[PDB]
Design a binder for this molecule. Sequence first.
Ligand code: CLA
Ligand code: CLA
Ligand code: CLA
Ligand code: CLA
Ligand SMILES: CC(=O)O[C@H]1CC(C)(C)C(=C=C/C(C)=C/C=C/C(C)=C/C=C/C=C(C)/C=C/C=C(\C)C(=O)C[C@@]23O[C@]2(C)C[C@@H](O)CC3(C)C)[C@](C)(O)C1
Ligand SMILES: CC(=O)O[C@H]1CC(C)(C)C(=C=C/C(C)=C/C=C/C(C)=C/C=C/C=C(C)/C=C/C=C(\C)C(=O)C[C@@]23O[C@]2(C)C[C@@H](O)CC3(C)C)[C@](C)(O)C1
Ligand SMILES: CC(=O)O[C@H]1CC(C)(C)C(=C=C/C(C)=C/C=C/C(C)=C/C=C/C=C(C)/C=C/C=C(\C)C(=O)C[C@@]23O[C@]2(C)C[C@@H](O)CC3(C)C)[C@](C)(O)C1
Ligand SMILES: CC1=C(C#C/C(C)=C/C=C/C(C)=C/C=C/C=C(C)/C=C/C=C(C)/C=C/[C@@]23O[C@]2(C)C[C@@H](O)CC3(C)C)C(C)(C)C[C@H](O)C1
Lengths: 228, 236, 177, 193
Amino acid sequence: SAKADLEAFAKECNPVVGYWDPLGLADLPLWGQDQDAVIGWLRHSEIKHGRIAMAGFVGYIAHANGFRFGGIGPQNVVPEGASAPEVWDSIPFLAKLQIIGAIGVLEHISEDKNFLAADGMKHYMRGGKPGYFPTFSANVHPMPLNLFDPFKWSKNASPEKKAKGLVTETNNGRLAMLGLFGFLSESKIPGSVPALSGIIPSYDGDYMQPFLPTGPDTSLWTIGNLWA
Amino acid sequence: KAELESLAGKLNPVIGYWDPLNLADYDQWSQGQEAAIGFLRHAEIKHGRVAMAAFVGYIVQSNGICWPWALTGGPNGVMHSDILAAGGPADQWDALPTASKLQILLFVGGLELWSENSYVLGLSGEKHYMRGGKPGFFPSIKKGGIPHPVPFDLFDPFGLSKNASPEKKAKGLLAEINNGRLAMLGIMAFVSESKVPGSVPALAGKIAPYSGEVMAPFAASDNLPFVADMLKSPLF
Amino acid sequence: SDMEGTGPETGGKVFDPMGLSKIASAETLAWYRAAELKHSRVAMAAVTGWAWVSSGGPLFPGYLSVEQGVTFESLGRDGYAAWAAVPEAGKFQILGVIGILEILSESAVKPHYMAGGTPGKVPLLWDPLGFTAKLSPETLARKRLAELKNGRLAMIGVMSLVSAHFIPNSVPLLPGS
Amino acid sequence: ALVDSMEGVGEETGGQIWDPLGISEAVSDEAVMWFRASELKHGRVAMLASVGYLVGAAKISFPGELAKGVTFASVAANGPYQAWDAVPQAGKLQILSIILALEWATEAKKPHYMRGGVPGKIEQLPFDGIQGLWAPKIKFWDPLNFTGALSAEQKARKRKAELKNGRLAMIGIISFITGHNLPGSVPALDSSF
Ligand code: CLA
Ligand code: CLA
Ligand code: CLA
Ligand code: CLA
Ligand SMILES: CC(=O)O[C@H]1CC(C)(C)C(=C=C/C(C)=C/C=C/C(C)=C/C=C/C=C(C)/C=C/C=C(\C)C(=O)C[C@@]23O[C@]2(C)C[C@@H](O)CC3(C)C)[C@](C)(O)C1
Ligand SMILES: CC(=O)O[C@H]1CC(C)(C)C(=C=C/C(C)=C/C=C/C(C)=C/C=C/C=C(C)/C=C/C=C(\C)C(=O)C[C@@]23O[C@]2(C)C[C@@H](O)CC3(C)C)[C@](C)(O)C1
Ligand SMILES: CC(=O)O[C@H]1CC(C)(C)C(=C=C/C(C)=C/C=C/C(C)=C/C=C/C=C(C)/C=C/C=C(\C)C(=O)C[C@@]23O[C@]2(C)C[C@@H](O)CC3(C)C)[C@](C)(O)C1
Ligand SMILES: CC1=C(C#C/C(C)=C/C=C/C(C)=C/C=C/C=C(C)/C=C/C=C(C)/C=C/[C@@]23O[C@]2(C)C[C@@H](O)CC3(C)C)C(C)(C)C[C@H](O)C1
């Protein structure tokens, strides 16, 4: 069932390559959790990684070129021209904390059964659609508009168009993974990828530590800043 | 197979199937014997095609001929004739910066990957050259994939071989095999005349020295990993 | 006799130039396989350790015994020299844990390998996460054969390391130290 | 009861009765009930002793004052062995008085665990039904009804887990005391044991 769906999805991802599982990961029981749950977890991890890689690629370009939003906000502390690894080095430490906290809020909403049963669908490890983010009709206060389609551009497309969109999403995600780690590899070891040699400067800090260079405690707030 | 007897007879009616080593019986891949003759035939045809290409490249690169394009990369670099000013056509390959050789080798590798693919070969109508099929057949670059359309296919790009006579195609295959053997002899004669001066009756004092290895693609100027550690001991 | 272990590289047949079977019963062959499997697994662990420590490896970060003056990096990169630099408490702990584990392996399998059972199937210490909990019976035999072959190769590997340490310039790829 | 229909067994010793010396075969049923009661009391005492010894070895103390003039950390300023001698004698006497009352009331119950009772099944209210003595109905084991949500199979499994943990805890507390008294015997105790 899940394995045959993997074979089909790998066929429409690349008919020349097809199903490419050298390290047999579609057969390991992770938590003693059957086959279909493992397949759903692997697909959800792949799709989440791909989406984060695509967003990180665009954000890396925006930070390295210099694309500050405006005034007063946290961009005031970041110097004009620092390369993309250093814009997550000079924003306030509480700004990093609240960014990662909001990402965790989105993850929790994505896997909350109450948010998920409000849309009539189940967990991806329990027979759901991998990579599906639920709506917001479970919050306690009404949300203006959801996360997947913020406007109503979607919802009129055919299911075949949605399937082609999912295949394109997965392929673009894998390619963005490769591109973003090409950036990160050039930022650490010189001459890793040939095209980016001399484009991206070298970095000294740890890429896997969110708060090893802790940002300043600068309280960018006016009007009623009673918290010092 | 045993059909290669008749093919060897068609290549040369005087000397038929000539194999002192009896290499058609050698099952080097432990598949069927048909796979062994298929591999040998495909290897011979590919070797021959590469040899005619390399022979014509050697002939037109050995006497002051170079393209008037640039191959620079941005306000500096090779002028595309400084490689010609490095000696004969064996120092020229060892002077093509670093990325040029990498992209050439990767293009040939992707071309061979397109050659080997059974989904691409099966979509044209043939199979892999050892699992039956036709040896030396290059599948279409258009039908198999490549989502952006390309202008031409590799074999017969301009289309000047369509609706040809099938017996003329068989004669062309036999002529390809014979000219491939002859071109392998020619290109190895030239490569031997690079290093060894005393070889062959002809070609005396017409060939560049090339103090280096013909069989080493990457040169001492490459900044790839190892390489310099791999070139710390020459040979004969 | 028939057993596992045989395959290619011998012709699909049993390898024993010196006889060492036809004087062996089911019990003796079970002991042969149990000793072979234990030696194999110990040798695989031994090559995976000596190769990792001596060649490269980041080594364990930390201190190793806060009181005595020893550091993980102060042990060294040699195999035998660093083993002597391990403290006596650590050596005794390793040997005692191994002895407790094997005594419980002998007293825990009720069809004993010398009295039935399956040789080499010791209780505990295999997959706690159940990686091979879903494998087919046909595939498991392939993995057992791969374990046997890799273990024999690792036996030769550990003895190559021991020979290179003790008598120099033996095992020509291995250096003088 | 009979040693055959008891809950020790365990998969560590294969799945049969471990007894290598034949103690349970030479003695009658009453001695087996005494042995099981002593084993379970030993295991529970050793579990509490192991947890307390680890807490004392980690220099963890209560925030406050043990006796007026004696801080908890003042007693815990040394190892767990040299902490029992730093507790005032009155406090240790009160601890032993509560333990004496618990042991006496536990054994005073009816169907003694040799004479019909279950060995190791200490009943919930040892200080109930005693004339001239009153106590609240706090249960000894499970003052909170934790083992009321469990079924019979879960209770049997957790009883087996209790027996295994008791045996491990006896080994551990004997290791701790022997390592303190004879240093270098147990290599797992660095200095503060
Ligand atoms: C972390 C990201 C991630 C995740 C979770 C997945 C997950 C999956 N991929 Mg996928 N993939 C990725 C990135 C990822 N992919 C990238 C970057 C590419 C492009 C190269 C692909 C290309 C790809 C193809 C072509 C196919 C899959 C397929 C699959 C599915 C099953 C096959 C499998 O074993 O998994 C993939 C295996 C892993 C993620 C391995 C785990 C990571 C290991 C432990 C670390 C290895 C690090 C090491 C240094 C890498 C060495 C690289 C080099 C030296 C060789 C599964 C859902 C198959 C499919 O379509 O099913 C849907 C399939 O045919 N993947
Ligand atoms: C004093 C504590 C104590 C007591 C009273 C018991 C009592 C019992 N155990 Mg038990 N056990 C203990 C400690 C104890 N155990 C420890 C620490 C372990 C871990 C090794 C075990 C492991 C164990 C297993 C695996 C099994 C039992 C079983 C049994 C029951 C039947 C065996 C019998 O008749 O022996 C009666 C025992 C005695 C009369 C105790 C004599 C002790 C002598 C006098 C001292 C010897 C100690 C020795 C020097 C080692 C000390 C050092 C130590 C730290 C290593 C019985 C109720 C079996 C069972 O429940 O089956 C139903 C069973 O299968 N026990
Ligand atoms: C064999 C059992 C045993 C023995 C003899 C000791 C002996 C000692 N402990 Mg100790 N302890 C034990 C078990 C034991 N501990 C356990 C299991 C724990 C973990 C909870 C602790 C935690 C502990 C701390 C945190 C401290 C001591 C301290 C001390 C010393 C002073 C006496 C004292 O204040 O008692 C206090 C003993 C306890 C609080 C343990 C109570 C044991 C009962 C039976 C458990 C009751 C169940 C329940 C979970 C408790 C909370 C219920 C409540 C919330 C309703 C003395 C050396 C103090 C010290 O370092 O010296 C001054 C100190 O500060 N102990
Ligand atoms: C001054 C010494 C003294 C005195 C006057 C008594 C008097 C009595 N004991 Mg007694 N006893 C003593 C010392 C003493 N005991 C000691 C040292 C022990 C050994 C620990 C015992 C053990 C003992 C047992 C085991 C029993 C008695 C019982 C009795 C009662 C017999 C009939 C009766 O009234 O039952 C009716 C019972 C009552 C009316 C109970 C009321 C008694 C309460 C506790 C008075 C409260 C006193 C108050 C707390 C102040 C005392 C301070 C002190 C703790 C420092 C009688 C009141 C029997 C009995 O039934 O009493 C429970 C009984 O079973 N005693
Ligand atoms: C030899 C050498 O070094 O070569 C180098 C060359 C070079 C270039 C340096 C390298 C690189 C970097 C690379 C290749 C990086 C790739 C990055 C990549 C591939 C980034 C994808 C982004 C996709 C996004 C953001 C999707 C948005 C999607 C959006 C906004 C939507 O969802 C909208 C939409 O869906 C709706 C809502 C409905 C649909 O109906 C319509 C659409 C679809 C519009 C390498 C790898 O290092 C190799
Ligand atoms: C009518 C029709 O079908 O249309 C088309 C369709 C079709 C099929 C697509 C065609 C095509 C494709 C093409 C472009 C084919 C090109 C083939 C090519 C390029 C073939 C080179 C061979 C080079 C050789 C043999 C070199 C020998 C070299 C020799 C013999 C030596 O040097 C010998 C020698 O060194 C020794 C051994 C020792 C020395 O002492 C002496 C010398 C130096 C003498 C055709 C054929 O154009 C016809
Ligand atoms: C359900 C079930 O199956 O239960 C399970 C329970 C449990 C705990 C999980 C199990 C386990 C596993 C474990 C951890 C077992 C551990 C066993 C362990 C650790 C046993 C140490 C012994 C140390 C000794 C005897 C020290 C001797 C010391 C001696 C003999 C001396 O040196 C004394 C002496 O120097 C003096 C003092 C002076 C003079 O007098 C001279 C001499 C030399 C004589 C089991 C076994 O699997 C069974
Ligand atoms: C001064 C004063 C006080 C005060 C105060 C107060 C009330 C301070 C309040 C500060 C406050 C209230 C700060 C909010 C920040 C909200 C942010 C950053 C939200 C971003 C939200 C974003 C970026 C949402 C984005 C998206 O939703 C979009 C748009 C579409 C969806 O599809 C997808 C998601 C969900 C991602 C005292 C001291 C308490 C009392 C005193 O008397 C007066």
